[PDB]
Design a protein around this ligand. Structure first.
Ligand SMILES: [Cu+2]
Ligand SMILES: [Cu+2]
Ligand SMILES: [Cu+2]
Lengths: 118, 116
């Protein structure tokens, strides 16, 4: 495929609202999406105060790096909070979700294999 | 287990010193033990550190976490800062340098064929 290198400020991508049965109070920037990625995509999620990505599972893994704020991670059993500078690996089919219990925005990078979309 | 949650700083960095890389530390956050498709590394470039120009058959996806990163391109260079992402196409010549007086950090992900 194509050659070259893209270098871009992530906030130059406008954050679009995500609203589904299980997600509320969340916006997403697609940084490296399906139109360019050979194997895996890179997104930057913003969780507004009180926002929720409720427990779910899916047949692909997820790799996360927390960029800003204190993120509550929902597990099959219970929950745990992480903050900026933590990573998360979610195996395929593992139950997971996320909540922002703070009064300021939380931001994290989220990468999945491109078979799971962008 | 099915979910790993960890502070990246606590992962032991590995010093890299070769003919092409000097003044660099690498943390393997999500490695080949765990990754079905792609791995997550965190690089720290010391002041004056260098990852010299190279290419490889796989792409790279980067997010700059701290500092001002100088990106070497096939010709010339471009400096970027915290908050930038970089997508390096397969086979594209690239490298990195830190011309500043403090450490630069970036997240780097590659498909598992590239190793960790
Ligand atoms: Cu998920
Ligand atoms: Cu499990
Ligand atoms: Cu490379």
């Amino acid at each position: 495929g194509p050659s070259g290198m893209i270098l871009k400020r992530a906030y130059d991508v406008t954050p679009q609202k995500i609203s589904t049965d299980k997600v509320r109070g969340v916006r997403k920037r697609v940084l490296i999406g399906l139109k360019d990625a050979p194997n895996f995509v890179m997104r930057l999620f913003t969780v507004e105060p009180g926002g929720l990505i409720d427990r779910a599972s899916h047949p692909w893994e997820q790799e996360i790096f927390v960029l800003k704020g204190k993120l509550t991670v929902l597990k099959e059993q219970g929950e745990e909070t992480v903050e900026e500078g933590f990573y998360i690996f979610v195996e395929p089919n593992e139950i997971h979700g996320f909540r922002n219990d703070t009064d300021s925005e939380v931001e994290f990078l989220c990468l999945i294999p491109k078979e799971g979309g962008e």
